[PDB]
Amino acid sequence: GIFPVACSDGYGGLVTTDPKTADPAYGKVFNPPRNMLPGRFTNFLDVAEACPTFLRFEGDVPYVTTKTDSDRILAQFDLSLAAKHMSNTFLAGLAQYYTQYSGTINLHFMFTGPTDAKARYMIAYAPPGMEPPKTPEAAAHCIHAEWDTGLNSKFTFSIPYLSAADYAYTASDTAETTNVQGWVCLFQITHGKADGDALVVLASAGKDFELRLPVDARTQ
Amino acid sequence: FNLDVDSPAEYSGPEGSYFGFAVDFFVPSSRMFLLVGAPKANTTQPGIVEGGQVLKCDWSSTRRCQPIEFDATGNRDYAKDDPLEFKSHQWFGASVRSKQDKILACAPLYHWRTEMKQEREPVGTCFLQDGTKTVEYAPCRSQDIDADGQGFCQGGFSIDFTKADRVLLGGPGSFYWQGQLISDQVAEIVSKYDPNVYSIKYNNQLATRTAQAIFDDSYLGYSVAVGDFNGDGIDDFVSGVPRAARTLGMVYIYDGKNMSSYNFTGEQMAAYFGFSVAATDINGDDYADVFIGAPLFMDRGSDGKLQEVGQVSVSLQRASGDFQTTKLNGFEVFARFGSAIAPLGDLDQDGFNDIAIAAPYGGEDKKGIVYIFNGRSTGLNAVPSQILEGQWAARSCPPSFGYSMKGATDIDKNGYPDLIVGAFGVDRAILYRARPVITVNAGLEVYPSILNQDNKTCSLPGTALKVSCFNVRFCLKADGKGVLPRKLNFQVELLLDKLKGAIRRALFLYSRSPSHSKNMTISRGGLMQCEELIAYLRDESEFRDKLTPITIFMEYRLDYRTAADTTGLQPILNQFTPANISRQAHILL
Amino acid sequence: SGNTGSIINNYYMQQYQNSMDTQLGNDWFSKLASSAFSGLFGALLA
Amino acid sequence: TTSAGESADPVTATVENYGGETQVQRRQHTDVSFILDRFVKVTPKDQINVLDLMQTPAHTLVGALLRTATYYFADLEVAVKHEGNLTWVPNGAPETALDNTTNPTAYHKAPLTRLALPYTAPHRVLATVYNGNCKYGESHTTNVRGDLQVLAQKVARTLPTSFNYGAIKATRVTELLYRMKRAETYCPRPLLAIHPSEARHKQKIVAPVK
Amino acid sequence: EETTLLEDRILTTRNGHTTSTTQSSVGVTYGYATTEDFVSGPNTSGLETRVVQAERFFKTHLFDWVTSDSFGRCHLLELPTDHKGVYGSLTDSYAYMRNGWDVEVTAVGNQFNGGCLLVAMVPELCSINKRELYQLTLFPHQFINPRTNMTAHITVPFVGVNRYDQYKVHKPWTLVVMVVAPLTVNTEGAPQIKVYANIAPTNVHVAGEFPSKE
Ligand SMILES: *[C@@H]1O[C@H](CO)[C@@H](O[C@@H]2O[C@H](CO)[C@@H](O[C@H]3O[C@H](CO)[C@@H](O)[C@H](O[C@@H]4O[C@H](CO)[C@@H](O)[C@H](O)[C@@H]4O)[C@@H]3O)[C@H](O)[C@H]2NC(C)=O)[C@H](O)[C@H]1NC(C)=O
Ligand SMILES: [Ca+2]
Ligand SMILES: [Ca+2]
Ligand SMILES: [Ca+2]
Ligand SMILES: [Ca+2]
């Protein structure tokens, strides 16, 4: 006779993400040539590394001005892709479609004031477990880097990926481990006649930044 | 109540020219004139049909209205065979405002070709004249063009002068009809004038900048008024925004020093709150009070039915910065009460400023009505002391008597300010004069007022019998401000037992009659004149009525015909002043 | 090449499954991120 | 790491700058071909549905990541729940054609029907952003507003009608899904997240026992 | 660069018979490609020709950068613009063109100014948003930081859905100049600063000559 086959139950339903191709309906079409077009990108994280985008601060500006008082905290925000400061970066607009990440986030700090304005800054990483620091002297016991302005006007610091698990969530739910990865605290050590300057700050992905498990929550 | 209605000054123009759409007084430096706006009047300007003109109407002697030449030219050209402007139907004279030697008229529908593409945008324009000088003032005619700019501004839709000689100009079409308030000092308007420059920049210009798109189609600058509200002497800017707040209507008040923002708001949808505004201190506290008109307001009656009557909101300015807002409703349905609001100054010279409100489409045959409201301590007396009626019938567009009006000007030097009313629908303009107010201190004394029937003191000639008599005594004293006769003759009337077909129980001795008249002639500001006479009771057996009090009535009438002056302006007696008083007398037992 | 967690290949010829490319005559943002200056730029002490 | 701020040269730093070590990473989930190869739901018209990819909701995964590239290529796969037979017609074909059975027509087979459709545009690559001649730009003016405003949409350009793979027509199309095959992308464009009102965009994640 | 505030990074650029020297340079940014793709295609039948007289700088004014301008102030210049040179007589002569751009933006105010400009070449810019300005560095860009430079030089190829373009109905590139940090005139800074562009087309190819009413 013919070949016996057992049509199994639970198989063959449409799955919107199955590794199967549809049946052809129309054949032998040749595309117009498109080899060597400018601007090809194959991976979304290749563009997130070669192209930093601005952060967002109080008043909706990409810069933080040099304050002259007993306070020296410029920015201090949750190390979270869902943070408010990160909300307009390409790295956080691309991470909203994934549930977990891993690796390093780079922050680019470009100083803008005139040639006679001078300042010294400090960026630290407060891991989760206790409150974040409020002065630079208390934050000097963290992982920090300190730079000052000169001929070279940009400094780049890599937020280290410390965590208990290998992956962390890109969303945030409640006060919980995976959604608070600590803080990142920007201080101003000194300044000389730098009143009202701007320190524009960018952000991008590190060498080992990773982002996996696609998802579709909402709101492009 | 003191306005002359018998023979008021009438002025007319070409039919269809809208003579009376705008009116004002013109007092230079020592003759007095009248300014009437006729925005549809044909001019001799080269190839311009209905350019509109403003007429200076001679009040002295004859009723001649000589037109005023602000601009005799036609449409200037941008290039060869490319007109720059369109003065045809520009509605020049739609708004006329004068201050001493300075006359400002405007053309809200003046269109202008851009300095780029060939457009036709109604930026509006104005012409300022200072005696021999005459410049052009088009603040909306600028580089900012086309709807979102000042292209459809129609600058000059409403105008007003401040006390520091600064012009306030309104344009309801700027920035997609958000509207715009523009203020320039009269100094720079002429000083920075340039006949070859179409967009003049003024160094000291105050203006409302463009706002968010949700403020579009609000019509700021629809109407304007000036007055101080922050207590620094400088006139501030009051303007109606009738489409603001989703057609609820608003009224903005800006600082007259830096265009810094009070804000009024309406209670009813599409009632056109802000169609007209006026600022005058109504309660004598030297604080400018805000008057806002909403002619389309609907009210409910005892039958609970909606009826469009119109409404004016009287906001008294308190030193607290707050306002004491009182709402005054219209009287006739669909008459649009509150279309025009005109401060009159102290019309009756009583100590408080007065104001006039019009229902242009009211009265019999839609002629028009103007209501006169007097001010007092508590605020504005809500009851009108006078009702001015139109006297002309319709042709196509209704007479619109009261659509525009102007007051607060003593044009005849009688010490009392007058009023102009424009009825453009019939191309007429009317000047009402204010008659001099005479306050009168009338007096009446009856002594003794308790009559003893058996007293029998005063003898009576002709008979040996004596009668119970007593004294009646009346006094007059009158005085008034402004120009008025120093002699005043009155007609005094006296009646005994006024309460009584019935028998009068008292009569005058030297006449034997209950009635007595006395031609009395007192002097203005002079002493109190007082004539007395003897009245007597009837005999006890002549009447049974002994319980009813005998009322003594005094009444007086002024001779208006002989009190007239030069033109025949007859004075009037003060309102709320009793034209007659009465005392009584009792009998005992 | 794209979405596969399985490899069941095709009944049909490539000439019917897809549209065929033509040659005339990972490119940019992969060379641009790989040319990223990673090393420290100063004179590192300690 | 210091550097010239405005060189526009990509400058990466690492955790070796302060004693760490860069770990290895797997990046298969952000590959353009991998991530764009899903079915995405599209709101269908009643009968006729021109198969444009810019008809996808922009807030979706495939919608938002497609609009992150100026130019794109892909073959298309379609899933359709319809009533009656479903006809396809290639790019540039008249509407009257949707009625003829000789064109690729799939007879009704429950519950749905998935077809592999080629690339039939005259263009070497399609576009998400089309601007024939539009911007000044200089932060565009308020000049056209109110009524003229809602008409003013096209004072510029942007029209995906020309860039159409084709159309489908059934008596009643109930559900429609697109799947991009062999997706190539060029010239990346902005991609935005949800702007939070708090200091951080909190949300409700699935909650097991512990 | 140099040991002092004084600055010597010389860069010269010759397009045609027109040069341009800068002493405060950061380098040229290449966007999306270093070379060109295939000019000869199956859509012009080999009737395409290169016009070498059209490849030379032309100048244009962008905007005044004043201290009152805050973050997000844009200036959009759609390329190709209205050109009165020989490159302009190509859109009236030929129906199809293709070319890259060599864009050099200048903002001269002394090094005692603060502030920062971001000049970027954006393809197919139909609409920009306030939040999308935060990700404007996804495009070929350079910053103009008055303490360090006055010039931003950006070279960029031809992009489109077609191999040749009809520039009378399509503007593929757009030069956007954005304020990322407002200007400051501290004590010695220049009060305002004018921004100019010095653009030059590259590899211009034309095809299909139209009739002439001459
Ligand atoms: C009886 O009949 C005779 C005649 O009619 C009455 O005569 C009157 O006497 C009055 C009181 O004397 C008198 O009042 C006026 O003259 C007064 C001086 O003679 C004078 O003092 C009064 O001023 C004051 O008067 C007013 C009056 O209202 C009082 O209110 C004040 O308190 C003061 O007293 C008056 O100027 C009156 O003129 C006089 N009239 C006549 C016609 O003779 C008499 O009063 C009667 N008496 C009875 C029985 O009632
Ligand atoms: Ca004031
Ligand atoms: Ca008052
Ligand atoms: Ca009064
Ligand atoms: Ca008078």
Author numbering:
A (entry chain 3): 1 to 220
B (entry chain A): 1 to 29, 32 to 263, 265 to 503, 506 to 594
C (entry chain 4): 15 to 39, 65 to 85
D (entry chain 1): 1 to 210
E (entry chain 2): 5 to 218
Sentences from the paper on this structure:
FMDV, a small non-enveloped RNA virus (genus Aphthovirus, family Picornaviridae), exists as seven antigenically distinct serotypes and many variants and sub-types. Structures of several serotypes determined at near atomic resolution have revealed a capsid composed of 60 copies each of four structural proteins (VP1 to VP4). A prominent feature of this otherwise rather smooth capsid is an exposed flexible loop (∼30 residues) on VP1, termed the GH loop. This loop and the RGD motif embedded within it (residues 145–147 in the O serotype) comprise a major site of neutralization by the host humoral immune response and mediate FMDV binding integrin89101112.
Although the icosahedrally averaged density for the GH loop and integrin displayed little detail, localized reconstruction enabled us to deconvolute distinct modes of integrin attachment, despite the variable occupancy of the integrin2324. For each virus the two well-resolved classes corresponded to distinct poses of the integrin, for PanAsia these were termed A and A′ and for O1M, A and B. The integrin portion for these complexes was resolved at 10.8 Å (pose A, 4.9% of sub-particles) and 11.5 Å (pose A′, 4.2% of sub-particles) for PanAsia and at 8.6 Å (pose A, 5.9% of sub-particles) and 12.3 Å (pose B, 6.7% of sub-particles) for O1M (resolution assessment uses the ‘gold standard' protocol). The slightly different binding mode on PanAsia (pose A′) shows the integrin ‘moved up' and rotated 12° away from the virus surface whilst the second binding mode on O1M (conformation B) shows the integrin rotated by 158° around the vector normal to the virus surface at the point of attachment, to bring three integrin hybrid, PSI and EGF1 domains together around the icosahedral 3-fold axes. These modes of interaction demonstrate the extreme flexibility in the presentation of the RGD peptide. In each of the structures, the orientation of the VP1 GH-loop is unambiguous. The GH-loop is pulled away from the virus surface, raising the RGD peptide by ∼20 Å above its position in the reduced O1BFS virus where the GH loop packs stably on the virus surface. This is achieved by rotations around residues at the base of the loop (circa residues 134 and 157).
